[PDB]
A paper describes a structure:
One of the most common forms of DNA damage is the baseless sugar moiety known as apurinic/apyrimidinic (AP) sites, with an estimated ~10,000 AP sites generated in each cell per day. The primary enzyme tasked with locating and processing genomic AP sites is the multifunctional nuclease AP endonuclease 1 (APE1), which is a key component of the base excision repair (BER) pathway. During BER, APE1 functions as an AP-endonuclease by cleaving the DNA phosphodiester backbone 5′ of the AP site generating a 5′-nicked BER intermediate.
Importantly, APE1 cleavage activity was not observed for ND-NCPs, confirming the cleavage specificity of APE1 for nucleosomal AP sites. In all three AP-NCP structures the AP site adopts a major conformation that is intrahelical, though we cannot rule out heterogeneity in the AP site conformation. The AP site at SHL-6 is completely solvent-exposed and no direct contacts between the histone octamer and damaged strand of the nucleosomal DNA are observed.
Residue numbers in the entry:
A (entry chain H): 33 to 125
B (entry chain D): 32 to 124
C (entry chain A), D (entry chain E): 38 to 134
E (entry chain F): 21 to 101
F (entry chain B): 24 to 101
G (entry chain G): 15 to 117
H (entry chain C): 11 to 118
Amino acid sequence: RKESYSVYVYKVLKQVHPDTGISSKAMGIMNSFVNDIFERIAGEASRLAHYNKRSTITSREIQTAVRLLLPGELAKHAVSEGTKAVTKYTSSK
Amino acid sequence: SRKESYSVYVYKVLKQVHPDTGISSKAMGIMNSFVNDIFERIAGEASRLAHYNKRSTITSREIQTAVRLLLPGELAKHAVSEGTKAVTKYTSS
Amino acid sequence: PHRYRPGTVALREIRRYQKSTELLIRKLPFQRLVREIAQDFKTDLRFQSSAVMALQEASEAYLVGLFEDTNLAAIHAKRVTIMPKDIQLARRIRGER
Amino acid sequence: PHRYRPGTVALREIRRYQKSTELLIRKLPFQRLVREIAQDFKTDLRFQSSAVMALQEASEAYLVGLFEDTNLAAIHAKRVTIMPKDIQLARRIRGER
Amino acid sequence: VLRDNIQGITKPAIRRLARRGGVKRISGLIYEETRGVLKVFLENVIRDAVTYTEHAKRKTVTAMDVVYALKRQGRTLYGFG
Amino acid sequence: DNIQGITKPAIRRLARRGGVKRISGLIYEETRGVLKVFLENVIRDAVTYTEHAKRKTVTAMDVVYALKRQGRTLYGFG
Amino acid sequence: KTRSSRAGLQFPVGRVHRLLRKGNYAERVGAGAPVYLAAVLEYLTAEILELAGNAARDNKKTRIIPRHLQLAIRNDEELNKLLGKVTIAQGGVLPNIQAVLLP
Amino acid sequence: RAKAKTRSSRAGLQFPVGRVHRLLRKGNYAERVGAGAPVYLAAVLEYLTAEILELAGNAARDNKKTRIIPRHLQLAIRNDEELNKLLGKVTIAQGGVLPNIQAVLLPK
DNA sequence: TCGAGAATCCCGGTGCCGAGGCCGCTCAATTGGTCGTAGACAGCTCTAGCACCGCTTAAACGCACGTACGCGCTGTCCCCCGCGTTTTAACCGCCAAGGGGATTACTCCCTAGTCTCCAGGCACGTGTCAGATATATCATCCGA
DNA sequence: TCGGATGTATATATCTGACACGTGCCTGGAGACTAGGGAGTAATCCCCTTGGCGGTTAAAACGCGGGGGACAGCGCGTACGTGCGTTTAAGCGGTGCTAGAGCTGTCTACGACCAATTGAGCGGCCTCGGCACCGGGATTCTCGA
């Protein structure tokens, strides 16, 4: 058993382009991009939690890591989507 | 609160290297910043090495490989020889 | 007869190798070079196919980027022909030297 | 009447500012510029003097490395006067543009 | 408020920085080029410094915020902190 | 002698993809030197990872990690 | 029931929580951190895929290949800045001939 | 319980081994930390500190100075090849620059 | 070459502030046990890295040929440098205040840990069509 | 600047091997419930950052020759493209086979954890010595002759 993001990357692709497909090499590249970004944000959040003598990664740390990592418009949109998702998650129990 | 610094040990090394040479507070702070930076660099490399091989512990061989990866040329060849010589002395109580 | 004037074919092959995504380097010579270089670090090493391929893709991208910087360094000196001093300047400024 | 020739009073002060370890930038103007720049990110900030000093040290180290690369680029073009195009090329090759 | 303090990085300061960099002769547009390179560098560093400050719920930019912001861009200032 | 397997036309093709119009003769050796240095640097860390893993084969993941260590992240192999 | 459907996302919130817990990042991991990170990852993936689909369509092709990903990444100012130090295998380069070389 | 012997003196080192064990355990590097890892890391750190202090003291002696200042650390790091390679992306505060005038600029 | 003149080094004397040692005392490193489990070790499997071999042919190599471009030389001029004079604002000192960065206290609620249940996504197999290839049919560029 | 002739797009038959889709099952993700410790909220202290005024004067801004370097133009010859013939080795498609990569089952030694115990190192206080500063003399470079 090996875990990849192929199913989710393919679902997102069907959302944004319902009439296009993705090759195997492109799926491998997308998995490597998702893993790289996950590792970057998680490491930045871990360092942020370490600097403040806290031992918990929260939405605050992930949001600040996103703001530190991604450029201006990309960071603003990512923060907006993350906040919206966290709000929806919380209200719907 | 009590801030911990490598001042005592750096001064000990200086006095065993140069018996009659002092060091200023700013140079001591730079040496502390260097020691912290190298500690965290080697420790992060060792952590990544342990993660890559699906291990759950940081042994002396991960530190050896991290030193080999991080220190250039003749510096690593000497640092490995000090690390192994210290570990040998340690395990003969 | 129709000798394409000096410089015009050189203008081409750029539009050809920037459109393509191939490797541009022979693969067996590169595998042999990789093995010869790796002999100096450990004897009787076996290489994975996806490892030689990864090395080739990384090295060719590195060389293409270096040549892109080198061309700028050569245009800076009011020249068109790249000389090795242009490569050395690019490497020195990038931090490699 | 004894006027130095244009190519000496300038290597002098090159030796001087390479021998020293000072800051070379006035401190109040730099602090004021830092505060002006930081007003765009959060209103009513209170910089710590050590932070303003670290900013100055880092900025001048960056500006000295950049001027070293600019000097190299200007010498590459068989020149002595550094031009803004030299700075542009240095930053482009460095990966800052 | 504060405006147009980039001219506080005077021409002699830029010439001294160039002299330490090893530059023997300077043009006349290098000053304006440098006053725009330095502003970009300072904005890039201070954005991350203020982000680190705001995350910690503080109102003062400590030297550790600047050190972490510099280390984020791969610059690792030794000294302070 | 395997560094001569990186022929003059291969370097010329890499230059053409890099946007180069004219190439001097000494480039075909100044480029082999750089390629050899880069390959040695990458293969040193790849073999270091291989030796630490108690393996005798260099997997693509070792090369990927060695490149990611030098700042040249590579997408497509893991 | 899945936390990805509860938050309206497609990436796995459970898998992201597991990776955050087993990744040696912090002693304990909050409850909204996986949701926030999954949302950010899904947003970035959607941006990349929507930009690559345009490049694939501009080539009269109904399939995304590494060349299209490279075009999409290098033609966007911010994606190219987030992935400046990344090499895409089989991605080629961006067509760019300097004006000096042209006749 | 016998007489207390520090782990850094049993190994012969000067850098602390208990402190390095504590920093490796409270640093979130791995779930577990081996017994010899702090000893190895302390030995490596001590060697690297001694290597820089040798050249810094040499530079201070060449300048007829008893004490070591950041300028001497910078002179030691930039002159030595391997220390310069290790610390090539590092800015030493109050360190200045290494005196290097290009040959072209010098007068004829 | 040569000597007046400016810049710099040396040598000494005086002051001053911080580097270093000393004392007190916490609290974090040491010692010594138990206990759980990570990985060391042996073993088996199967897979993919290696070696070889024939064949085709694409690419590399060598050699004329020419032309255009890199490099050196010469002339202009313009713009940057060295220097003297005049602001001017940095800088040091010394004062006052209050904002907020560090602390402790308490408690509460959020997350880790565990047991139980179930669904989704990961190998596995299969039709099938998106796209690559062979073949024929208009932008540009080289020469009077 | 159009005539001849190259080297791209454009249009169509023809596979075929990756792509997207059934599937089933088993492992990882939900769901409930409990314990406890991280941290969020309150209140306080003091320190250190902001703000201000006066006096010095070091430094920036200015203005003026003037020389030297950047720029442009000419010319030359060489070395790098362009094309043609060859020959050299790269692909490719098979073969065999065997090192060793990967997965499983014990079970043993090692690391976490906890409960006293204490000494190492952190904090506060001198203080005298190394270093900065100035004043003057000796030494070294420099540039118009």
